[PDB]
Amino acid sequence: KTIVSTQKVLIPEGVKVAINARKVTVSGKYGTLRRSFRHLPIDIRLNKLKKYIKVVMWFGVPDSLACIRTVCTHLKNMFTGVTKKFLYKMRLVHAHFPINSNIVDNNTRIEIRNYLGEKSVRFVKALPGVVIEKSPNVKDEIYVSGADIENVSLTAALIHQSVLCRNKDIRKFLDGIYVSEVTTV
Template identity: 50%
Template sequence: MKTILASQTMDIPEEVTVTVKAKFVKVEGPRGTLTRDFKHLSLDFQLTEGGRKLKVDAWFGSRRTMAAIRTAISHIQNLITGVTKGYRYKMRFVYAHFPINASITNSNTSIEIRNFLGEKR
Protein backbone atom coordinates (compact mmCIF):
# COMPACT_ATOMS: atom_id res chain seq x y z
CA MET A 1 0.00 0.00 0.00
CA LYS A 2 1.26 3.47 -0.85
CA THR A 3 1.21 6.41 1.50
CA ILE A 4 -0.17 9.64 0.02
CA LEU A 5 2.30 11.99 1.72
CA ALA A 6 5.12 11.28 4.13
CA SER A 7 7.37 14.09 5.33
CA GLN A 8 10.01 14.80 7.92
CA THR A 9 11.68 18.04 8.92
CA MET A 10 15.06 18.75 10.44
CA ASP A 11 16.50 21.83 12.11
CA ILE A 12 19.53 23.56 10.63
CA PRO A 13 22.05 25.08 13.08
CA GLU A 14 22.71 28.83 13.06
CA GLU A 15 26.30 28.63 11.79
CA VAL A 16 25.34 26.46 8.81
CA THR A 17 23.80 27.52 5.49
CA VAL A 18 21.93 24.92 3.42
CA THR A 19 20.88 25.52 -0.18
CA VAL A 20 18.69 23.15 -2.17
CA LYS A 21 18.38 23.25 -5.95
CA ALA A 22 16.77 20.37 -7.85
CA LYS A 23 17.72 17.59 -5.37
CA PHE A 24 21.25 18.99 -5.11
CA VAL A 25 22.01 19.90 -1.48
CA LYS A 26 24.89 22.23 -0.62
CA VAL A 27 25.93 22.70 3.02
CA GLU A 28 28.28 25.53 3.99
CA GLY A 29 29.79 26.00 7.43
CA PRO A 30 32.87 27.14 9.30
CA ARG A 31 35.00 24.20 8.10
CA GLY A 32 34.09 24.42 4.42
CA THR A 33 31.47 23.36 1.89
CA LEU A 34 30.03 19.91 1.17
CA THR A 35 27.61 18.94 -1.58
CA ARG A 36 25.48 15.89 -2.21
CA ASP A 37 23.21 14.92 -5.09
CA PHE A 38 19.94 13.11 -4.30
CA LYS A 39 18.67 12.83 -7.88
CA HIS A 40 18.38 9.05 -7.58
CA LEU A 41 15.67 9.42 -4.90
CA SER A 42 12.10 10.42 -5.65
CA LEU A 43 11.90 12.94 -2.81
CA ASP A 44 11.10 16.66 -2.59
CA PHE A 45 13.41 18.95 -0.61
CA GLN A 46 12.21 22.34 0.68
CA LEU A 47 13.74 24.96 2.94
CA THR A 48 11.21 26.49 5.35
CA GLU A 49 11.20 29.14 8.08
CA GLY A 50 13.79 31.32 6.40
CA GLY A 51 16.22 28.51 5.69
CA ARG A 52 16.29 27.25 9.30
CA LYS A 53 14.37 24.00 8.61
CA LEU A 54 14.65 21.45 5.83
CA LYS A 55 11.54 19.48 4.88
CA VAL A 56 11.75 16.22 2.93
CA ASP A 57 8.54 14.96 1.29
CA ALA A 58 7.64 11.74 -0.51
CA TRP A 59 4.40 11.60 -2.47
CA PHE A 60 2.71 8.24 -3.10
CA GLY A 61 5.74 6.32 -1.94
CA SER A 62 6.33 2.67 -1.25
CA ARG A 63 8.04 1.31 1.86
CA ARG A 64 11.40 1.78 0.18
CA THR A 65 10.67 5.43 -0.53
CA MET A 66 9.53 5.98 3.06
CA ALA A 67 12.84 4.56 4.29
CA ALA A 68 14.70 6.87 1.90
CA ILE A 69 13.29 9.93 3.70
CA ARG A 70 15.11 9.15 6.93
CA THR A 71 18.22 8.10 4.99
CA ALA A 72 18.35 11.45 3.17
CA ILE A 73 17.93 13.38 6.43
CA SER A 74 20.72 11.32 8.03
CA HIS A 75 23.03 12.07 5.10
CA ILE A 76 22.32 15.79 5.41
CA GLN A 77 22.94 15.67 9.18
CA ASN A 78 26.30 14.01 8.46
CA LEU A 79 27.10 16.82 6.00
CA ILE A 80 26.27 19.36 8.72
CA THR A 81 28.52 17.53 11.18
CA GLY A 82 31.30 17.56 8.60
CA VAL A 83 31.20 21.33 8.08
CA THR A 84 30.87 22.18 11.79
CA LYS A 85 32.92 19.64 13.78
CA GLY A 86 34.74 17.73 11.04
CA TYR A 87 35.72 14.07 10.94
CA ARG A 88 38.97 12.37 11.83
CA TYR A 89 40.04 9.04 10.36
CA LYS A 90 42.67 6.71 11.73
CA MET A 91 44.22 4.06 9.53
CA ARG A 92 46.03 0.97 10.69
CA PHE A 93 48.07 -1.32 8.44
CA VAL A 94 47.58 -5.05 8.97
CA TYR A 95 49.27 -7.84 7.06
CA ALA A 96 49.20 -11.62 7.27
CA HIS A 97 52.31 -12.86 5.44
CA PHE A 98 53.98 -10.17 3.34
CA PRO A 99 55.02 -7.09 5.33
CA ILE A 100 53.71 -3.75 4.09
CA ASN A 101 55.87 -0.65 3.96
CA ALA A 102 54.17 2.73 3.78
CA SER A 103 55.44 6.28 3.52
CA ILE A 104 53.64 9.59 3.70
CA THR A 105 54.32 11.85 0.71
CA ASN A 106 53.22 15.17 -0.80
CA SER A 107 53.46 17.16 2.44
CA ASN A 108 51.31 14.75 4.49
CA THR A 109 48.46 14.55 1.96
CA SER A 110 48.94 11.08 0.45
CA ILE A 111 50.15 7.63 1.45
CA GLU A 112 52.35 5.44 -0.73
CA ILE A 113 52.16 1.71 -0.01
CA ARG A 114 55.24 -0.28 -1.00
CA ASN A 115 55.71 -4.05 -1.07
CA PHE A 116 51.96 -4.67 -1.30
CA LEU A 117 51.24 -8.43 -1.66
CA GLY A 118 54.98 -9.14 -1.79
CA GLU A 119 55.70 -7.25 -5.01
CA LYS A 120 59.29 -6.14 -5.49
CA ARG A 121 59.98 -3.14 -7.68
Protein backbone atom coordinates in the same frame (compact mmCIF):
# COMPACT_ATOMS: atom_id res chain seq x y z
CA LYS B 1 0.68 4.11 -0.88
CA THR B 2 1.21 6.37 2.14
CA ILE B 3 -0.22 9.76 1.19
CA VAL B 4 2.38 11.85 3.02
CA SER B 5 5.57 10.77 4.74
CA THR B 6 8.09 13.21 6.12
CA GLN B 7 11.36 13.68 7.98
CA LYS B 8 12.93 16.65 9.79
CA VAL B 9 16.71 17.29 9.66
CA LEU B 10 17.89 19.96 12.12
CA ILE B 11 20.60 22.18 10.57
CA PRO B 12 23.35 23.05 13.12
CA GLU B 13 24.44 26.59 14.05
CA GLY B 14 27.31 27.66 11.74
CA VAL B 15 26.03 26.13 8.50
CA LYS B 16 25.10 27.86 5.22
CA VAL B 17 22.72 25.46 3.46
CA ALA B 18 21.17 26.01 0.06
CA ILE B 19 19.06 23.41 -1.74
CA ASN B 20 17.31 24.17 -5.02
CA ALA B 21 16.04 21.23 -7.10
CA ARG B 22 17.45 18.55 -4.82
CA LYS B 23 20.98 19.92 -5.45
CA VAL B 24 21.87 20.49 -1.79
CA THR B 25 24.93 22.63 -1.06
CA VAL B 26 26.27 23.07 2.47
CA SER B 27 29.06 25.40 3.56
CA GLY B 28 30.70 26.04 6.90
CA LYS B 29 34.03 25.93 8.70
CA TYR B 30 35.52 22.98 6.80
CA GLY B 31 34.70 22.75 3.10
CA THR B 32 31.75 23.34 0.79
CA LEU B 33 29.91 20.10 0.02
CA ARG B 34 27.48 19.70 -2.87
CA ARG B 35 25.58 16.46 -3.43
CA SER B 36 22.52 16.04 -5.69
CA PHE B 37 19.53 13.82 -4.90
CA ARG B 38 17.75 14.23 -8.27
CA HIS B 39 17.21 10.46 -8.70
CA LEU B 40 14.46 10.00 -6.04
CA PRO B 41 11.16 11.98 -6.11
CA ILE B 42 11.20 14.27 -3.10
CA ASP B 43 10.33 17.90 -2.28
CA ILE B 44 13.05 18.63 0.24
CA ARG B 45 12.07 22.07 1.60
CA LEU B 46 14.22 24.48 3.56
CA ASN B 47 13.36 26.65 6.53
CA LYS B 48 16.00 29.41 6.83
CA LEU B 49 14.28 31.53 9.58
CA LYS B 50 13.88 28.60 11.99
CA LYS B 51 16.53 25.85 11.65
CA TYR B 52 15.59 22.38 10.17
CA ILE B 53 14.84 21.11 6.65
CA LYS B 54 11.85 18.91 5.83
CA VAL B 55 12.17 15.98 3.45
CA VAL B 56 8.69 14.99 2.28
CA MET B 57 7.43 12.29 -0.06
CA TRP B 58 3.95 12.13 -1.53
CA PHE B 59 2.62 8.59 -1.99
CA GLY B 60 5.15 5.79 -2.69
CA VAL B 61 5.59 2.33 -1.15
CA PRO B 62 8.01 1.54 1.70
CA ASP B 63 10.85 1.93 -0.81
CA SER B 64 10.10 5.64 -1.08
CA LEU B 65 10.03 6.04 2.70
CA ALA B 66 13.37 4.24 2.95
CA CYS B 67 14.84 6.54 0.30
CA ILE B 68 13.58 9.58 2.21
CA ARG B 69 15.23 8.35 5.40
CA THR B 70 18.48 7.72 3.52
CA VAL B 71 18.38 11.24 2.10
CA CYS B 72 17.82 12.68 5.56
CA THR B 73 20.76 10.69 6.92
CA HIS B 74 22.98 11.91 4.08
CA LEU B 75 21.97 15.50 4.79
CA LYS B 76 22.81 15.04 8.46
CA ASN B 77 26.20 13.60 7.54
CA MET B 78 26.90 16.53 5.25
CA PHE B 79 26.01 18.96 8.01
CA THR B 80 28.32 17.15 10.41
CA GLY B 81 31.14 17.28 7.87
CA VAL B 82 30.80 20.95 7.35
CA THR B 83 30.69 21.63 11.08
CA LYS B 84 33.42 19.15 12.02
CA LYS B 85 35.52 16.99 9.68
CA PHE B 86 35.04 13.22 9.75
CA LEU B 87 38.08 11.47 11.17
CA TYR B 88 38.59 7.86 10.16
CA LYS B 89 41.34 6.54 12.40
CA MET B 90 43.05 3.70 10.49
CA ARG B 91 45.44 1.53 12.50
CA LEU B 92 47.95 -0.55 10.55
CA VAL B 93 48.76 -3.92 12.07
CA HIS B 94 51.76 -6.03 11.10
CA ALA B 95 53.17 -9.37 12.28
CA HIS B 96 56.79 -9.37 11.11
CA PHE B 97 57.44 -6.58 8.60
CA PRO B 98 56.57 -3.02 9.69
CA ILE B 99 54.55 -1.13 7.06
CA ASN B 100 56.15 2.08 5.74
CA SER B 101 53.31 4.60 5.36
CA ASN B 102 54.76 7.58 3.46
CA ILE B 103 52.31 10.43 2.85
CA VAL B 104 53.14 12.70 -0.12
CA ASP B 105 51.58 15.31 -2.45
CA ASN B 106 50.12 17.73 0.14
CA ASN B 107 48.77 14.89 2.35
CA THR B 108 46.91 13.14 -0.49
CA ARG B 109 48.55 9.98 -2.03
CA ILE B 110 49.84 7.61 0.66
CA GLU B 111 52.66 5.37 -0.59
CA ILE B 112 52.52 2.10 1.36
CA ARG B 113 55.76 0.12 1.28
CA ASN B 114 57.13 -3.13 2.75
CA TYR B 115 53.74 -4.81 3.26
CA LEU B 116 54.65 -8.41 4.22
CA GLY B 117 58.12 -7.47 2.89
CA GLU B 118 57.72 -7.30 -0.91
CA LYS B 119 59.93 -4.27 -1.81
CA SER B 120 57.21 -2.81 -4.07
CA VAL B 121 55.10 0.34 -3.68
CA ARG B 122 51.30 0.58 -3.20
CA PHE B 123 49.95 3.97 -4.34
CA VAL B 124 46.53 4.96 -3.02
CA LYS B 125 45.38 8.44 -3.99
CA ALA B 126 42.67 10.09 -1.88
CA LEU B 127 39.40 11.39 -3.37
CA PRO B 128 38.71 15.12 -3.98
CA GLY B 129 39.42 17.03 -0.75
CA VAL B 130 40.40 14.52 1.92
CA VAL B 131 43.59 14.86 3.97
CA ILE B 132 45.57 11.76 5.05
CA GLU B 133 47.61 12.53 8.19
CA LYS B 134 49.75 10.21 10.29
CA SER B 135 49.78 9.88 14.09
CA PRO B 136 50.82 12.56 16.57
CA ASN B 137 49.73 10.48 19.60
CA VAL B 138 50.27 6.72 19.03
CA LYS B 139 52.84 5.04 16.68
CA ASP B 140 50.99 3.05 13.98
CA GLU B 141 47.69 4.77 13.08
CA ILE B 142 46.70 7.02 10.15
CA TYR B 143 43.99 9.71 10.23
CA VAL B 144 41.88 10.05 7.10
CA SER B 145 39.70 13.17 7.18
CA GLY B 146 37.76 15.80 5.27
CA ALA B 147 34.13 16.88 5.43
CA ASP B 148 32.44 14.52 2.92
CA ILE B 149 31.68 11.36 4.96
CA GLU B 150 31.30 9.50 1.70
CA ASN B 151 34.71 10.45 0.34
CA VAL B 152 36.83 9.94 3.45
CA SER B 153 35.22 6.54 4.00
CA LEU B 154 35.84 5.62 0.37
CA THR B 155 39.48 6.66 0.69
CA ALA B 156 39.85 4.53 3.81
CA ALA B 157 38.31 1.56 2.00
CA LEU B 158 40.68 2.06 -0.93
CA ILE B 159 43.65 2.16 1.44
CA HIS B 160 42.50 -1.06 3.07
CA GLN B 161 42.13 -2.72 -0.33
CA SER B 162 45.62 -1.59 -1.33
CA VAL B 163 46.99 -3.53 1.64
CA LEU B 164 44.92 -6.73 1.85
CA CYS B 165 47.09 -9.80 1.17
CA ARG B 166 46.25 -12.22 -1.60
CA ASN B 167 46.66 -16.04 -1.74
CA LYS B 168 47.23 -17.06 1.87
CA ASP B 169 45.22 -18.03 4.95
CA ILE B 170 43.82 -14.68 6.04
CA ARG B 171 42.87 -15.95 9.53
CA LYS B 172 46.58 -16.58 10.18
CA PHE B 173 47.96 -13.46 8.46
CA LEU B 174 46.13 -10.60 10.17
CA ASP B 175 48.45 -8.04 8.52
CA GLY B 176 46.94 -4.91 7.08
CA ILE B 177 45.51 -1.47 7.72
CA TYR B 178 42.07 -1.27 9.27
CA VAL B 179 39.50 1.31 10.32
CA SER B 180 39.64 1.45 14.12
CA GLU B 181 37.41 4.44 14.90
CA VAL B 182 35.06 6.56 12.84
CA THR B 183 34.98 9.92 14.63
CA THR B 184 34.83 13.70 14.31
CA VAL B 185 37.32 16.38 15.44
